[PDB]
Amino acid sequence: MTAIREIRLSEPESAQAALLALECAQRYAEPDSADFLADAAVLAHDLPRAVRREVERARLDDRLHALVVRGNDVDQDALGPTPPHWRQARTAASRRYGFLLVLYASLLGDVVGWATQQDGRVVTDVLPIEGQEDSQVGSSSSVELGWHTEDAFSPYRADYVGLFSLRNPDSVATTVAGLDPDLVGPAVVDVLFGERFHIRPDNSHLPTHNSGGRLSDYFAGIVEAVENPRAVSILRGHRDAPQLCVDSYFTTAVDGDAEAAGALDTLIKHLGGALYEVVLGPGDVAFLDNRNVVHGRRPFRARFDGTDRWLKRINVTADLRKSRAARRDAQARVLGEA
Amino acid sequence: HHSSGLVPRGSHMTAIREIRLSEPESAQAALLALECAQRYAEPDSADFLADAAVLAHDLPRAVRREVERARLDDRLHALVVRGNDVDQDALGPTPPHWRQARTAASRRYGFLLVLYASLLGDVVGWATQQDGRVVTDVLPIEGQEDSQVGSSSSVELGWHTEDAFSPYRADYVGLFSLRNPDSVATTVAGLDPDLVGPAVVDVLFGERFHIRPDNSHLPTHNSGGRLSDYFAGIVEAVENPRAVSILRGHRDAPQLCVDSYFTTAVDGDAEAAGALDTLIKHLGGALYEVVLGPGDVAFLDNRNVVHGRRPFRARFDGTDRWLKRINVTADLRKSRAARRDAQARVLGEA
Ligand SMILES: NC(=[NH2+])NCCC[C@@H](N)C(=O)O
C-alpha cells in the first residue's frame, strides 16, 4: 500500500531544496561535474530533514515501486523553450534542475551514466524529438513507450531511475508495474527464476541515438549483447521479495524452451494489465525502484513548438564499487568507458 | 584542532585515511550518540536502524566530507577516525565474555559506531556470530587464548578477508576502541600488483580456488538446530565448494578475497596452488598494523584488505582491550535472499 511513497513538499521544503540547488549551480559548471559528484552525497544531506526521513524509508523498502517528491520550484519563464533534441538540452536555465535531481538521487545511492546513452551524460533529457514519434526510445511521443526494466540487458543496470519533470502540460503519465508472485503461481515464478531468457540492449544504446562523433568501440559491448545475449533469469533474490528484470520489446525465452516461452507470455499479460499511471507535474521527481518495477510512458501528441513535455533523467546505483570493471577510473560514473 | 591526511603503506599512497576530531567535533558526535541512546532501545534495534542513515548526517560536516572521500576511494585500506570521547570511569570493567558485553554503560559507543558506519553503507550481522548481534564485542575470553576467533589473545589471529567464503561478505569491518592499554594492533594487508608476477595475478583472477567457511560458521555440539538450513548450506560450501576467484573487477583496482587458513586451489590445479601460495607469502610479508586507542574507530575496506590481530597477553582482570565491532554493506538489498525480512540485518537468519 506504500509501493508509491508520495512526499508533497511544503513551501519552505521546496524553497530550501531550490536554494541548495542554486548554491550548487553557483559553485559547479555541470550537474555531473566530477567535483560536484564527489561532494554530492554530503550536499544531499542539506535537503530538508523531514524529506530525507521519507526518502530513507523508500530506500530500505524492498517492495517500493516509486518514491515521488511533489512540488519542487520550477520557473517556467526562466526555463525557456523545450529544446528540440537532447543534444541541445544542456541549457544554462535547466542546470539548477539537473543539480537538484542529483541531490535527491544521492540520498538513494551514487549516480551513473552509460557511454552508449546520450553521449555518456549522467544527467540525461527525456523530450519528444521530430522523427522519433514511433520509436521505442525516451524521445518518442505518438507510440506508447513499452514497459521495461531500465538497461535490463546489463548486470550494471540502475537500482533507481530518477525522473524530474520540468514541464508536462498535457499530464502525460509514466507507466509502472511490479510482479505479485502469488498472482502468477510458484510454477511460473520457478521458471522466471531460471537462467532461461535473453534480454537484449534497447535502441537508446545504438549509434542512432548518440552523436556520430562517438567511438565505434563504445558500441562493441552493446552489439555483442544484441548478437550473443547471455542466458539470464527474469526473477532473482528472495521468493518473498524477488527482483524483476525484463523488457517487453527486447526479452525472449532461449531457443526450444517452450515452458520459459510460456512463462514469459504469462508475465507480459500480468504486467500489461497491472500497468498503472503516475503523472509527473512540473517540479515532481520520481525514483522508480528498477529492481521491483518495469516502466514506460503513455502515448501523446507533441506540438514541437517549445512547450512540450521535458524530464531530466538519472540512473542511481546502491553500489558504485561493483561496476569498477566497467568504469575508466574510481570516480568516473560512465558505465562502458572500460 | 581538526586534521585529516593520507598515510602511505608501501606503494599504497591512500592506504590509511586518518581523521583527527577537534574537541568540538568529538563533543558533537558524543552528544548525537547520547541523544540516540535516549530515543532508541538499542544500537541495532529496528527503530534506530530505519533512521541511522539520516541521523549519521548530523555528525560534523568536515568529518562527513572526509568519510565520503574514503567511501569512494577504491584503493582504501583503512579509514581511521581518532579522538572520540570515552569516559573510562563510567564505562567500568571489560566484560569477561561477549555474552555479558552488551552493557548499559557501553551502549553510547554502540550507537556512535553505527552512526559512523551508516555514512559508508548499511550495518549487518551474521546468524552464527555472537547470536546475530549487529554491534559485536571484541575482548579476550579465558579458554579462547589459542583459538582463531576475535576473543583470542596469546596466538596471532591469522589474516583473512572477513567471511571470505560468502557472496554476502561485508564491504567494511568497523572497530570502535573502548580501551587498549597495551596498544594491541589489528593486522592489515592489501595486494600490491606491481610486486607480483602478472602471470600470478592472471591466475588469481581465474575461478580456480575454493574458499571454505571459517570456524565462526561451522556447526558444533552447541550451534543449535534453529540454524539447520544455514548449516546445510555451510556443509555444502565445505564438502562441494564452488570454484571462485581470489581477484575480481578492474585490473587497475582489483578486489581481494582470500583466507590464509581456508583457501585451496581446485583439485589438480598445481598452477593455481602455486599462485595462491605466492599471494599468501606476499600478504604475509606486507602485513602492517593499525592500533586504535580509546575513542579511535577504524573501517577496513574488506574488498581490498585481509586483517588479523597480533598475539597479546590478556590479564582477564577487567582492564583488557575492548572494541565494539560492526559489518557494513554498500548494498543491503543484494542479501535479501539471506535475511528474514526487508529490515532485518542478520545474514543467514532466512
Ligand atoms: N521500450 C522498451 N521496451 N525498452 C527501451 C526503452 C528505452 C528507454 N529506457 C530510453 O530511452 O532510455
Numbering used by the authors:
A (entry chain A): 1 to 338
B (entry chain B): -11 to 338
The authors write:
CmnC is an α-ketoglutarate (α-KG)-dependent non-heme iron oxygenase involved in the formation of the l-capreomycidine (l-Cap) moiety in capreomycin (CMN) biosynthesis. CmnC and its homologues, VioC in viomycin (VIO) biosynthesis and OrfP in streptothricin (STT) biosynthesis, catalyze hydroxylation of l-Arg to form β-hydroxy l-Arg (CmnC and VioC) or β,γ-dihydroxy l-Arg (OrfP). The overall structure of CmnC shares similar folds with canonical non-heme iron oxygenases. The catalytic iron is bound by the 2-His-1-Glu facial triad comprised of His148, Glu150, and His295.
To assess whether we could control the substrate stereoselectivity of CmnC, we performed site-directed mutagenesis and created a CmnCL136Q,S138G,D249Y triple mutant, of which the three residues around the substrate binding pocket were mutated as the same with that on OrfP. The activity assay revealed that the triple mutant CmnCL136Q,S138G,D249Y almost abolished the hydroxylation activity with ∼3% relative activity to l-Arg; however, it showed ∼6% relative activity to d-Arg. The mass spectrometry analysis suggested that the compound 2 is hydroxylated d-Arg, of which the mass units increased by 16 a.m.u. compared to that of d-Arg. To illustrate the molecular detail of the engineered CmnC that switched the substrate stereoselectivity, we solved the crystal structures of CmnCL136Q,S138G,D249Y in complex with α-KG (CmnCtriple,α-kg) and d-Arg (CmnCtriple,d−Arg) at resolutions of 1.67 Å and 1.75 Å, respectively. The crystal structure of CmnCtriple,d−Arg revealed that the substrate d-Arg loses partial interactions and adopts a different orientation in the binding site compared to the substrate l-Arg in the wild-type CmnC. In contrast, the side chains of Gln136 and Tyr249 in the triple mutant CmnCL136Q,S138G,D249Y make close contact through π–electron interactions. In addition, the water molecule bound by Ser138 in the wild-type CmnC is lost in the triple mutant. Nevertheless, the relative activity of CmnCL136Q,S138G,D249Y for d-Arg hydroxylation is not as high as the wild-type CmnC for l-Arg hydroxylation, implicating that there are more residues participate in the substrate stereoselectivity. The structure-based enzyme engineering changes the substrate stereoselectivity of CmnC that accepts d-Arg for hydroxylation.
